[PDB]
Design a protein around this ligand. Structure first.
Ligand SMILES: C[C@]12CCC(=O)C[C@@H]1CC[C@@H]1[C@@H]2CC[C@]2(C)[C@@H](O)CC[C@@H]12
Lengths: 8, 243
């Protein structure tokens, strides 16, 4: 997910 | 008071919405600008959260999960505070370039919800809430919505939560120091049904967003479509102090 990747 | 130090230190500053105030107050523009703001304020919510005490002890999926579930309430609570402190609660201080008067409240088609948010704001005055109380309460709000079957590491979450409660207890730290606790727990509870209404509204909006020319930024659309429905469908629920 785009959130999963920004947050990591 | 090491915990306050942190909370005061990490508290995010002003965030402008990018709203063009020269254009008229269309439904599409107010809402696309609030969606932008949301995406902007989420950046700050994330950075803040990561720097909270104990937060990075949570399993990382839990971390992302609670942020994605609680952003609305957190963001609504902070906006209520800003409105209290900057416009003594006549209007809604979303961003310095996105202040809702009643006309905008009506044109957003969320007059109903905006009424509920203005109450929230008034309560900050009504109850004489200190800045330290706001901060401790706002942090608790991050830990106030969970999957009904639990998070990967639910035991670490309950402990953290417990600890944020004791801190609010501490900042309140025996008839006021108790009736006060009742009141703020009451005020915190009140955020949830307001966030519930906004989840319903935004989700509804995202679904019909080609029909009304409302732009949703990338991560907002993901969160509204994957996460928010878990709340709306009852898979994920607020934790209330009082039933
Ligand atoms: C969280 C935001 C944006 C940040 C803020 O200060 C509070 C505000 C509450 C209403 C939300 C909005 C983000 C955009 C939403 C979700 C719209 O889609 C409908 C309701 C809006």
């Amino acid at each position: 997910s785009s959130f999963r990747d920004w947050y990591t | 008071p090491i915990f306050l130090n942190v909370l005061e230190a990490i508290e995010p500053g002003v965030v402008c919405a990018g709203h063009d105030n020269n254009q008229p107050d269309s439904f599409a523009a107010l809402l696309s600008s609030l969606n932008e703001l949301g995406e902007r304020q989420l950046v700050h919510v994330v950075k803040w959260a990561k720097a909270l005490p104990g937060f990075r002890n949570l399993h990382v999926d839990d971390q992302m999960a609670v942020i994605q579930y609680s952003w609305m309430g957190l963001m609504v609570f902070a906006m209520g505070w800003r409105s209290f402190t900057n416009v003594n609660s006549a209007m809604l201080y979303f961003a310095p370039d996105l202040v809702f008067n009643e006309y905008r409240m009506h044109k957003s088609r969320m007059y109903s919800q905006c009424v509920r948010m203005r109450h929230l704001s008034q309560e900050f005055g009504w109850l004489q809430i200190t800045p330290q109380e706001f901060l401790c309460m706002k942090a608790l709000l991050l830990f106030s919505i969970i999957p009904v079957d639990g998070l990967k590491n639910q035991k670490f979450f309950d402990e953290l939560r417990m600890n944020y409660i004791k801190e609010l207890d501490r900042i309140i730290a025996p008839t006021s120091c108790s009736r006060r606790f009742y009141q703020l727990t009451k005020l915190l509870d009140s955020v949830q049904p307001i966030a519930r209404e906004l989840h319903q509204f935004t989700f509804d909006l995202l679904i019909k967003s080609h029909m009304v020319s409302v732009d949703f930024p990338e991560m907002m659309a993901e969160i509204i479509s994957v996460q928010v429905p878990k709340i709306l469908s009852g898979k994920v629920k607020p934790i209330y102090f009082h039933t």
